[PDB]
Write a protein that binds this ligand. Structure first.
Ligand SMILES: [Mg+2]
Ligand SMILES: [Mg+2]
Ligand SMILES: [Mg+2]
Ligand SMILES: [Mg+2]
Ligand SMILES: [Mg+2]
Ligand SMILES: [Mg+2]
Ligand SMILES: [Mg+2]
Ligand SMILES: [Mg+2]
Ligand SMILES: [Mg+2]
Ligand SMILES: [Mg+2]
Ligand SMILES: [Mg+2]
Ligand SMILES: [Mg+2]
Ligand SMILES: [Mg+2]
Ligand SMILES: [Mg+2]
Ligand SMILES: [Mg+2]
Ligand SMILES: [Mg+2]
Ligand SMILES: [Mg+2]
Ligand SMILES: [Mg+2]
Ligand SMILES: [Mg+2]
Ligand SMILES: [Mg+2]
Ligand SMILES: [Mg+2]
Ligand SMILES: [Mg+2]
Ligand SMILES: [Mg+2]
Ligand SMILES: [Mg+2]
Ligand SMILES: [Mg+2]
Ligand SMILES: [Mg+2]
Ligand SMILES: [Mg+2]
Ligand SMILES: [Mg+2]
Ligand SMILES: [Mg+2]
Ligand SMILES: [Mg+2]
Ligand SMILES: [Mg+2]
Ligand SMILES: [Mg+2]
Ligand SMILES: [Mg+2]
Ligand SMILES: [Mg+2]
Ligand SMILES: [Mg+2]
Ligand SMILES: [Mg+2]
Ligand SMILES: [Mg+2]
Ligand SMILES: [Mg+2]
Ligand SMILES: [Mg+2]
Ligand SMILES: [Mg+2]
Ligand SMILES: [Mg+2]
Ligand SMILES: [Mg+2]
Ligand SMILES: [Mg+2]
Ligand SMILES: [Mg+2]
Ligand SMILES: [Mg+2]
Ligand SMILES: [Mg+2]
Ligand SMILES: [Mg+2]
Ligand SMILES: [Mg+2]
Ligand SMILES: [Mg+2]
Ligand SMILES: [Mg+2]
Ligand SMILES: [Mg+2]
Ligand SMILES: [Mg+2]
Ligand SMILES: [Mg+2]
Ligand SMILES: [Mg+2]
Ligand SMILES: [Mg+2]
Ligand SMILES: [Mg+2]
Ligand SMILES: [Mg+2]
Lengths: 114, 97, 155, 68
RNA sequence: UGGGAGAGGGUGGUGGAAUUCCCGGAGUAGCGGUGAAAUGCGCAGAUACCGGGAGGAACGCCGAUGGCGAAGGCAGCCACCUGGUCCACCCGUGACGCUGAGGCGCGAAAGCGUGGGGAGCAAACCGGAUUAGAUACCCGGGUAGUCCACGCCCUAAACGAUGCGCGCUAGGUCUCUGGGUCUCCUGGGGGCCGAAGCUAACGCGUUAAGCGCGCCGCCUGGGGAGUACGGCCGCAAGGC
């Protein structure tokens, strides 16, 4: 049991994954569009991200989590609705920062990004 | 089934069977050919082969003309194929976005 | 239509309870413009409601209407290359229309021989939360909830 | 609110002027556009190069996480 | 002589972001992917998260309708070596000039040879979809290659589809870069709109496709055909 931790929102166009860690970044629990029951492209809807964030927040609070910092990566649909679901869950959102990785012009991307 | 009208001409059961064998090229697309109807007729410049066919995805209406009657029939088929292949694939075009 | 909205036809109140909703119910029962028959079947059932259950026909009939009103429904829409059952809220006009339609349709599924018996009994059950009518409203609502994930396509 | 107007004289080649150079960086760490710095073409090039040297020395950052 | 701007070129070094992979930790029921899917990956512990390491390639913001080069083409940053170019002074030489058949050099990408390197990507290839079929488009894999050195190849929508040089013929507006006296003026670039004029039209118009002089290259109906034969070049592909 730890009361302070982190919430990562990995949110792509296909899915949204929420992992709740401790102060050091070690995962406590996690959820996703698949864990809340969806398959296929439904996992990339905002309601999907919503259920996933709530199911992740619920599990975390079951271990005494009360405060989280929120780290957000990716520009997926359910990104903004996932932040909502965390706030409106019971957890205390101490902060929200976007840590989306961006190359400083690095590796050549797959054909579909050119 | 399939009906064949020979307007102001006379044709044999052999020619009617040729038309049915040529219309069978449309069976390729594996869609329902619903009451296909071929009209054969002669202008002063050659023969005219008309056709009206409904399918689950629309209607086919085409007209072929040529001196040689079997060629007018073939021109009819060519126009009917391009119409059917359009009906069967046009909806695929805008899957994205 | 394309140019403008359509204006909802106002119905004259019926002559036994002064109700406009009771009128719309009669019309939904009416086949081939036999309104005399249509009214007689409803009222004949309003006696059966009274005689099998000692309370107000009007009240029983109206509660069964609220018990069939679907609050949400699915409305199809092709998105790219897939037909999606979009969950949608139902306008009160349409709620009423769906309620009355399903009542009669479900009543006429019944096994009871005389129609006014089928109209009475279905309105009796639906007043309590039973019958194939209320089932149809529940079924439609469960469809809408099942597809809440598509609720952002709503127009 | 253009950054150059918020500063007196400075040397556009002082790669160690951490406290002046840092104003020409967005809160996310990026080099700010000419529209938000108020420099001409010629001096924006000197600024960009100087910021880059200062980055390599560790004075200025290459990127910062965006905090809502 | 005194100045300037610049992704101009060559060599050695060097920085951070990101991807992938390997190790450690924490954690579990899916992840991924699409129009929707499936193949694929995952309880032999994947994805998502944190820490450490390895390695290659490309340099986000700045960055622009921008800059530089003869063209190809050139973009993190530092140093060295080095080319072109513009400006002010009007100091030196005294027509020393223009063009240029041949020649010589340069010449994107792909390709070739020898050696190295290989993260990502990805011809060929394999598999999943799509579809009437789908030797494709989309998806999951994947070898050459993409990268470096040296040597070849010598092509292109190598384009402004517009050879180079000079002189001449309204202006207006935006911009890069110099010199003034900094209002503005004046050089050199880069765009837009337009005087006269040109043009079959579209359009061009002091960055001419205008008006003229010089010199070079090239066209002479479509196909056959950039093919055949010859010759020259190339390791080959194939080029002229
Ligand atoms: Mg998905
Ligand atoms: Mg017949
Ligand atoms: Mg006949
Ligand atoms: Mg006709
Ligand atoms: Mg054919
Ligand atoms: Mg009805
Ligand atoms: Mg029903
Ligand atoms: Mg029930
Ligand atoms: Mg000098
Ligand atoms: Mg591990
Ligand atoms: Mg085990
Ligand atoms: Mg890591
Ligand atoms: Mg850019
Ligand atoms: Mg330019
Ligand atoms: Mg130039
Ligand atoms: Mg002199
Ligand atoms: Mg002299
Ligand atoms: Mg020359
Ligand atoms: Mg020559
Ligand atoms: Mg070459
Ligand atoms: Mg190459
Ligand atoms: Mg190559
Ligand atoms: Mg080979
Ligand atoms: Mg080889
Ligand atoms: Mg090689
Ligand atoms: Mg060999
Ligand atoms: Mg090799
Ligand atoms: Mg490999
Ligand atoms: Mg295949
Ligand atoms: Mg197949
Ligand atoms: Mg086959
Ligand atoms: Mg394939
Ligand atoms: Mg592929
Ligand atoms: Mg791949
Ligand atoms: Mg090979
Ligand atoms: Mg090889
Ligand atoms: Mg040549
Ligand atoms: Mg061009
Ligand atoms: Mg040019
Ligand atoms: Mg040419
Ligand atoms: Mg031509
Ligand atoms: Mg020439
Ligand atoms: Mg000429
Ligand atoms: Mg000027
Ligand atoms: Mg000045
Ligand atoms: Mg000019
Ligand atoms: Mg113009
Ligand atoms: Mg004129
Ligand atoms: Mg002329
Ligand atoms: Mg001008
Ligand atoms: Mg003039
Ligand atoms: Mg010019
Ligand atoms: Mg011309
Ligand atoms: Mg010829
Ligand atoms: Mg040849
Ligand atoms: Mg050739
Ligand atoms: Mg030969």
């Amino acid at each position: 049991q730890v009361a302070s931790g982190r919430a990562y929102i990995h949110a792509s166009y296909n899915n949204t994954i929420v992992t709740i860690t401790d102060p050091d970044g070690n995962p406590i629990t996690w959820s996703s569009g698949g864990v809340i029951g969806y398959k296929g492209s439904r996992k990339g809807t905002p309601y999907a991200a919503q259920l996933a964030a709530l199911d992740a927040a619920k599990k975390a609070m079951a271990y005494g989590m009360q405060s989280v910092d929120v780290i957000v990566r990716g520009t997926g649909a359910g990104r903004e609705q996932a932040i909502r679901a965390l706030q409106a869950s019971g957890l205390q959102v101490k902060s929200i920062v976007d840590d989306t990785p961006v190359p400083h012009n690095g590796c050549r991307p797959k054909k579909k990004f050119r | 089934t399939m009906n064949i009208t020979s307007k102001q001409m006379e044709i044999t059961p052999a020619i009617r069977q040729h038309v049915a064998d040529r219309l069978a090229k449309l069976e390729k697309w594996q869609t329902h050919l619903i009451n296909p109807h071929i009209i054969l007729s002669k202008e002063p410049q050659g023969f005219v082969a008309d056709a009206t066919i409904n399918t689950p995805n629309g209607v086919l209406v085409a007209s072929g003309k040529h001196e040689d009657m079997y060629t007018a029939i073939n021109e009819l088929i060519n126009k009917l194929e391009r119409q059917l292949n359009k009906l069967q694939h046009k909806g695929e075009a805008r899957r994205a976005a | 239509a394309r140019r403008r909205r359509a204006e909802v036809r106002q119905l004259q109140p019926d002559l036994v309870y002064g109700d406009v909703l009771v009128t719309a119910f009669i019309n939904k029962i009416m086949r081939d413009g036999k309104k005399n028959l249509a009214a007689r079947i409803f009222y004949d059932a309003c006696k059966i409601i009274q005689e099998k259950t000692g309370q107000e026909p009007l009240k029983v009939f109206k509660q069964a209407v609220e018990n069939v009103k679907p609050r949400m429904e699915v409305r199809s829409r092709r998105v790219g290359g897939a037909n999606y059952q979009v969950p949608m809220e139902v306008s009160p006009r349409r709620q009423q229309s769906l309620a009355l339609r399903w009542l009669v349709q479900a009543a006429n599924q019944r096994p009871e021989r005389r129609a006014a018996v089928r109209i009475a009994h279905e309105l009796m059950d639906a007043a309590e939360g039973k019958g194939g009518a209320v089932k149809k409203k529940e079924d439609v609502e469960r469809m809408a909830e099942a597809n809440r994930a598509y609720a952002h396509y709503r127009w | 609110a253009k950054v150059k107007a918020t500063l007196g004289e400075f040397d556009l080649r002082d790669y160690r002027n951490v406290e002046v150079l840092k104003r020409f960086l967005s809160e996310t760490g990026k080099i700010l556009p000419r529209r938000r710095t108020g420099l001409s073409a010629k001096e924006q090039r000197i600024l960009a190069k100087t910021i880059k040297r200062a980055r390599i020395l560790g004075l200025l950052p290459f990127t910062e996480k965006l905090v809502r």
